[PDB]
Structure formats: structure tokens, C-alpha cells
Amino acid sequence: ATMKYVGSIDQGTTSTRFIIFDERQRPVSVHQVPHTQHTPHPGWLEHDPMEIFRSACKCMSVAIAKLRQKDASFRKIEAIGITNQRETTVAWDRVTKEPLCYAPVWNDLRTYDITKKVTAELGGGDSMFASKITGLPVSTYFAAFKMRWMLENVPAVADACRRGTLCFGTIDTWLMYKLSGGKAFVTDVTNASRTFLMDLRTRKWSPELCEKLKIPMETLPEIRSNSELFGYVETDECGVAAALNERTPIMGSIGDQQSALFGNMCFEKGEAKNTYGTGCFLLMNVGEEARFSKHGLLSTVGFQVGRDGPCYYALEGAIACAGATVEWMRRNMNLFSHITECEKLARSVPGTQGIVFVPAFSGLLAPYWDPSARGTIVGMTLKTTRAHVIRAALQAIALQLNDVVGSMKRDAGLNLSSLRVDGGLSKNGLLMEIQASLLGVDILVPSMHETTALGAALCAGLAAGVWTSLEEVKAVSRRENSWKTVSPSGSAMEREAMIAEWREALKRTKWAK
Amino acid sequence: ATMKYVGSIDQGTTSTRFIIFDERQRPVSVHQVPHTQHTPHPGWLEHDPMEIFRSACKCMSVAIAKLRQKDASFRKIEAIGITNQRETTVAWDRVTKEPLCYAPVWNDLRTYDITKKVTAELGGGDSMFASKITGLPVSTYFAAFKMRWMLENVPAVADACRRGTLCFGTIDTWLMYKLSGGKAFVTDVTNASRTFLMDLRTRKWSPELCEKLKIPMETLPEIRSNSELFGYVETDECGVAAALNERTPIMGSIGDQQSALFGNMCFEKGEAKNTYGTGCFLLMNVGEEARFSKHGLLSTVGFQVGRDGPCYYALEGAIACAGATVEWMRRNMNLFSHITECEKLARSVPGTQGIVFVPAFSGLLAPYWDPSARGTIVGMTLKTTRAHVIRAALQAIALQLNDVVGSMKRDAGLNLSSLRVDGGLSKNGLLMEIQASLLGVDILVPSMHETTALGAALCAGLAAGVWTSLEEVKAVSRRENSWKTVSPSGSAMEREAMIAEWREALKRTKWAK
Ligand SMILES: CCCCc1cc(=O)oc2c(O)c(O)ccc12
Numbered sequence A, B: 001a002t003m004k005y006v007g008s009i010d011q012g013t014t015s016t017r018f019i020i021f022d023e024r025q026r027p028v029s030v031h032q033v034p035h036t037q038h039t040p041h042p043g044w045l046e047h048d049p050m051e052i053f054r055s056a057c058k059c060m061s062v063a064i065a066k067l068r069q070k071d072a073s074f075r076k077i078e079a080i081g082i083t084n085q086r087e088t089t090v091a092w093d094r095v096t097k098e099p100l101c102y103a104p105v106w107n108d109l110r111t112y113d114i115t116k117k118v119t120a121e122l123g124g125g126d127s128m129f130a131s132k133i134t135g136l137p138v139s140t141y142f143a144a145f146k147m148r149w150m151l152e153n154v155p156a157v158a159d160a161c162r163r164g165t166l167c168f169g170t171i172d173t174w175l176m177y178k179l180s181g182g183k184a185f186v187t188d189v190t191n192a193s194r195t196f197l198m199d200l201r202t203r204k205w206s207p208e209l210c211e212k213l214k215i216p217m218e219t220l221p222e223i224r225s226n227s228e229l230f231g232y233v234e235t236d237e238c239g240v241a242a243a244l245n246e247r248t249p250i251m252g253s254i255g256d257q258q259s260a261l262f263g264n265m266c267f268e269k270g271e272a273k274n275t276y277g278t279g280c281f282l283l284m285n286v287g288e289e290a291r292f293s294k295h296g297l298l299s300t301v302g303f304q305v306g307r308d309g310p311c312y313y314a315l316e317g318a319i320a321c322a323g324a325t326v327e328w329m330r331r332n333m334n335l336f337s338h339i340t341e342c343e344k345l346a347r348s349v350p351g352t353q354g355i356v357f358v359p360a361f362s363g364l365l366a367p368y369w370d371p372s373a374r375g376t377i378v379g380m381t382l383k384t385t386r387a388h389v390i391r392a393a394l395q396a397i398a399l400q401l402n403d404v405v406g407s408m409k410r411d412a413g414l415n416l417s418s419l420r421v422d423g424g425l426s427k428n429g430l431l432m433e434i435q436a437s438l439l440g441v442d443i444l445v446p447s448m449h450e451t452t453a454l455g456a457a458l459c460a461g462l463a464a465g466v467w468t469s470l471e472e473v474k475a476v477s478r479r480e481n482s483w484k485t486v487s488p489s490g491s492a493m494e495r496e497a498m499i500a501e502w503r504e505a506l507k508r509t510k511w512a513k
């Protein structure tokens, strides 16, 4: 037994990557390819499904080739895992194998009207109507409403449903389909948990809802766990089956945010993760029993290692403008030029001294869904510099995440144990300190940042016996991959003063329509 | 009929100038000398009267020495005019001919307590109790309270009162005293209007107010008009009688703002001036009858040509943060560097696209009155840029002016005829365009921008026959000096939405204490 290897396809909003991990959980090869962000109308975003599948195959054969020149005794990958951008919905044909049309992406707003009609004509105007089934409000994000929009507005996709050809799938299903050659038509529970068609507690499709929303269940794939035989890679798109050499199983499929949870060893209830990027998603493991939300937050599947494995559930909240706020201060406002000046400028001052900046540029998410909320700054005087604004933008992210976490503590009935953080903005020391102070917990910053991709590789390693227990996983991690830990430090009437200010700033934010 | 020349001493907060004008109303010589800003305690400001007097003298003889070197037709100054920082109060002794202490400046805060005590005990808690007599509210600015402060806190002044050698005087009075060698103890109507001791209906000192604030009337100079024989220069302090050569009468005397009103030719009722400086002072001529405000605006004297000539009254409004908001965006927020960029960045976008920036850094003055209001921005999206923010600051300035003008029109019972503009921000044509479009009158931008100095030069030259009427003053300006006219150029519907957004934004500015 020499060095075994597990591959992860990371199919994100703006690019696709393939990372190869070894049995020590180290990324040893990686390759990235971008895809086009088609915006036909304002607020619309579409991806081209064949560009994504193509990107993924290019990623695999370049990653393989590169590893095979740093380890010339590398004959095979044990298994492939997939993690992907969730909610993004593809429509394809049973026999022609091709996309009927482009894939509306998770944050697309073409499903606006369909979202209105549904809440009214099915929920009696209550957005939470189906939420004890799914765990979700009715929104433009989820996969069913996109399914609905295409069936309605796309000649080709209408006919495909008519003829009994039509397949529908999130990006995990699509990738697993095209990688197979048509063989497997499958999804994992976490991904399925975002369709608006799956029962959260049972992890089975709801025939109530599919029929209530007129989606022919012929179009839907078979649900499985995150960690088991899904299919085999055997397409020849960019030499990919050739490059792998042996028949390679796909034994790993898991949505992106939950992959970051799993990748961060957030296995026990209480353990939570935050992924900074353009925005934030926070997910907390809540345990083997599903918890529902009185604050807006989503309930979703955290993970499920194996067919009839214990299924852990989670709560989920988002902030829309996290790293976008920093990048906005830079490129839109000229408040600094170089990425590190941001942090240095915020430190250069002691407080925000009066000011609050609430960066609700595209609305308020979290536990106050106000899409009339806009970007706002209150309390300025002639003493206000860009440093205070910069510092206040970071305080505001951390304050939203506080409001978010507090809403989870009540919904979940337990504390936040600790908080793992990954992404651009977690390299910011000051934000991590402010974040810790307000939550009063440890913030663990992993120095192997590649944890979204690691998630899917863990799934497929467990299912294929590269590791065997979630404990060996925890132990290999602890040994191999270090982490910076940042503790809370500060007062209680600082914390409560900062929030009292925040509460008052939030009243002043309502503006659009 | 040889060339005639009028001189204007322009004694400001931070410096003194002497500008000599020719009969074409052209500035032909200038010299500027600054004086020391004495700050004994935070909030306090004080000027040395003797340093101020010498400055004026230096300015005169230097500017005269320069002119006779560059103009062979300059033989003499026909008359001298004075324009001055108002409200600044000088306590001197009629036998030593010298000050008993330094002079507290208009914006000095050491009179605050005295001011609160006058409001409570003389006004029953009403700061406006004397506003139908004086045109003014109880405030730190006004002369009477500085006079009162100096009796109560300055032994030398209190002694001088007792001994009956005390002269109180605004800077017009101090300058005409010392230029006389102590022979003239006069003030002009406009400066008297800022003492809190003059009755606007009579333009005479109010026996009741003198009695109630306990300033004896023997301390006070004689009230005369803006344009008449005050005195003659007969000091040789810094060579100034030597430089003037012939006997030179002092025949003009007018407070700085009113001077600008008059240098801007606002002789008829409904004609207004606005100075776009660090802040904004807008004065409108309301005609021969005083008008009082229901919106916190000051009623004041505008001008009076001739001993007991017709007396034109004004309303006065201020905005605190004009050029200061421009300076803040550059200095504190790094939105631009070179001053030309402010206008170019604001022109580079076609509107503000929903944002509003209320630059209420030091509160709202003007016709809303909120010391709690702070600098606020609302409505930002990820499309918002420094360009939109800069343009909104400019809109904001014009919007407050619009409101101030609005109030004046209601209080005065008249329309705004035209707006003459001056100060540095008047060279920002986009601001002048936005302002025309908002008020829907023409804005007149004089190219000879020395409007404060010219006021005093016109008063003095009228009295000495250099110009024989206001019609002749107006005609020489047209012929000799260009005015750029700037016309309303947007839509009434855009006008209205800007005002609606402005009114919404104001509701979100309350922050402080
Ligand atoms: C307008 C309702 C949006 C629902 C939403 C809330 C949230 O806190 O996180 C989300 C989220 O993480 C998604 O991927 C999609 C939708 C939401």
C-alpha cells in the first residue's frame, strides 16, 4: 500500500476546479477553468451546462497530468467526489443528452413572478407555507421555481416534458449524468434539500409538492446519501476516462456550503462554519433531529455519510455583501488601493466613533428579510475618515453574523460551540477578532483553506475506504493541517453598546420601492 | 475728468485686504496681511485689535505703493470703504485709545452660559422673545452677549465702564475709530443690526434691550448709514497718510454679507446673493419693510445709501457645510485628489441613481433645526461609486439652498428674481447648473468675483460722486465686467423627485445624543 488519492470536482458559481487530495488530506494537484456569466436581462444570470461539464473535464485531465509528473508512481484515483453550487438548475434530454437551454443560476431573478403566484395561489400568501416539508421559504433561489420557469418559458423544454424525454437536475446531477455517459441519474440529500421538492425529515421527494407545483416526477433523479457508489466516470470529453486509467467510481456528492461544513470537521451538533466570499453563508450542525426556524433562516441537510447512515441536519443563514463590501470600498469608492490597506486602515483607528455603515447594498438577508434596505451610513461628523468607514464595514459584517447566530441559538436550542471560518475575508485578522468578541466563541481559521473541496473528497474517501470512520478523518486532519485560533477579548457593555448602535442604524436603512 | 479710484478695506476673520478699484469697478491693486488667531480655551476665539488695525494700514500703503508703480494715471484714492467680519466685538478706552482686552470673534462660544441665562430669565425659555425688535434669536454670535461677557469677566473693561471711558464697537467701528486717530465713533446700520441692541423698525438703539442686557448706551457708537461721510484717514500708523498723500475720506462701511449682497447689485426686492464658501450664506433683499421669519432665518438690514436714505431689509440664511463637504470628501474619504476632479467625477454620471448624501456633519441649520442630525448616506447599491456620492453632495448643497430660499419667499411674500453667486464653490458649474434647475431662476456668476470688497467700494464711491446712482453702478458692471448666466436646464419632474428623495433622506439623519 503506497499513496492513495481522492479527487474533488469543485463546481462553483464563476469557475470549476478539480483538486486531488492524498490520504493525509493534502491538496497535491489542482486545476481551475472559468465559465461565462451570461446576463441577458438585469438581475438574470445563466450558465452554459456544456461549458461547465467541459470545464470540469479539462480540470480533471490537467490535474491528473500535473500530479503524474510530481508522483510518477500514480496509476489511479480511488474515487471522485463532487461539490457544486446549489440551486442552479439544468434542463436536458433523456436521449439527445444535450441541454434544452441555459441553466438559471441560484441568484437569478427571472423566477420573480413565479415566486409571487406560488406564495399567493398555494401558500395563501404565507411564504413559509411548505416549510415544515422542505425547511425553506418560497424564494427565487430554489430549484423547483426555475424548473417551473423553464417548463413555462422555453419551447424546447416544454416539448421535452411532452415527449417524456425531459430530465431536470442540480449541478451535481448534471455532472454525474454527463460524467457517466447517461448511466447515472442521481442527486445527494444536501443538494436535493434545496429543490423545494424534498421532505427534510424523510429525505424523499414530496409528491404533494411536485404535483402541487406541476413537476412530473419522471424528470427528477433518485436521491441517495452523500457517501456511496453513484456511478462511474466513463466519458471521453477531454481525454478524461483515458487520463484516469482505471474505471473511476464517483462516490461523493454534496452541495457547496455543506461540503464546507463537512470539510471543516463540523460533525457534532453545535459546531458551525462560515464561508466568506462575495457574501457569507453560515451553517451550524444542529444534530440528528431537524430544527425549524421562526426567524427566516433555512433548515437543510448538513450531511449523511452512507446509505442509511445517521443524517445530521443544519440551520443556514446568509449575508449578501461580505467581501463584495470590501471590494466595493476599493474599486467603487477609492477608499484604499491594495487589499492589505483595508485591514491596516481599520486598525489605525480605535473605534467607529459614532458611525454605523450598514452594507445592505442588495437588501438585508439573515433574520430580517428587507429587500427595501439599501447601503447606508449614519452618524458622520467632520472627524470621520475612510478608516472609520472601513472599520464600520467590518463591524457590520460581524454584527449581521451575530444577529444570524443568535437566531440559530433560539431555533436550534443549543449554543454555538465554535465557529470555523474560511474565505478571502477570514485572512483579515481584525474581522476575525471583532467576530469572536461579539459571539464570545473561538474562531478557527484553517491553514489548509481548501475545505469546500475537501468535503466532497472526504465523502468519497469514506465510501471507498481511504478512511473508514469520521474519527480517523478528525485525527488525520488534526495531525496534518494546522489552524489559527482567535479568541474573544473585550467587554460586555462594549458588545451591548455596539449592538444598540446597530439596532438603531438598521431602522434607517429602508429605501427602495 | 481724470481716472478715479476707490479703496476697500476688507477685514475678514482670518485676514485683512485692501483692494483699490477703478471707476470701471476693476480691482487694480491688492495686498493681504493676516492676523493671529488666539484660542485661550476650546471653543474660544479672539483677535488682537491692534494687529488688525495695523494690517489694514499695511495693506493700504503697500497696495498703494504697488499701484502707483503700475498705473501712471493713479494720483489718489477718492474715498475708502470698509467691509468687515460682523459681530466680533472690541472693548477699547476713549483716553488710552487702546483695547482693554482682545476681541471675541463672531463664532466664539464663551458666551454660551450668558446666552442660556438670557433665554431663561429675560425670555421665559423663549430664545425668540426679542426677534420682532432685533430680527435675531438669542445666540453666541451676537455682539451684545460678548459685550455682556466682557463686563462680567474682564476687570479692565468693568473698570473702564465705571470710569465712563468705555467704547464698545464692532470692527467697522473700531477701524473707523483708529483710522480717525480716535475722531469718529460710528457704526453702519448693517453692523448695528447684529448687536442684539438695535431696533429694526427704527434702526436706532433700543433703550429697553440696553436696559435689560445691561449695556449702558454711552458705550455705543452712533448709528449712521452704509454710504456717507464717516471720517477721514489721519493716522500715519504704517505710513498710510504718507501713502494716501492727499486727504482721504472714509465714506463706506457695511458688514461682510450685506457687502456681498450690495456688490452683487441686489438692489431691488426679491434679488438674492448666495456665497458658496466653507458654508453658505444666502441673503435676499426683501424691500423697504422688515420681514420676520417663521423658519429660524435672521431678519437684518441689507443696506442704506445716504444718511436717512431708503433702507432695504433682508433675510439671511446659512448652511454650515458647503466647501467643507467638498474638502472632507477629498481629505477624509479620498474620493478625489485635485480639486478639478470633484466637478469631473460628478459630470461623469448622469444622476445619483437613487442615493442621497445629507452632509449634516455639524447638524442641520437652515429652515429645519436639528443639532441631532448627522452626516448620512442612504440608498447605495453595488452600482454606487464615488462619482454618484460626489454628485449627491453637490445636489445636497443645492437642495438646502432650495429649502432656505423657499422659506424666504414665504416669509417675505415674494418670488426669487435671480441669484447672484460667489465664493469658490461658485466655480463648479455643475453645482451652478443643478441649482438653476432646482430653483428655476437664472444664476448670475460674476467674473469679477471680488464682490465683498466691491460692496464697500460702491458705498464709498456713491457717497463721493465716483458713481452717481445705483443705475450707473449697475450699468458700469454690465459694460465693464462679464456675468456668466446659467439657466434652469433639467425637467420639472426630475426637480420634483430630487426634492422627494431629499425629504425622505432628512427623516433618517437624527443620530446624535
Ligand atoms: C428572499 C428569501 C431568500 C432566502 C435565503 C435566505 C438565507 O438566509 O440564505 C439563503 C441562501 O443561502 C440561499 O442559497 C438561497 C436563499 C436564501
Ligand SMILES: CCCCc1cc(=O)oc2c(O)c(O)ccc12
Residues within 6 Å of the ligand: B137, B139, B141, B281, B296, B297, B298, B316, B317, B318, B365, B366
Ligand atoms: C443658533 C441659531 C443660529 C441663527 C442663525 C440662523 C441662520 O439662518 O443664519 C445665521 C447666520 O447667518 C449667522 O451669521 C448667525 C446666526 C444664524
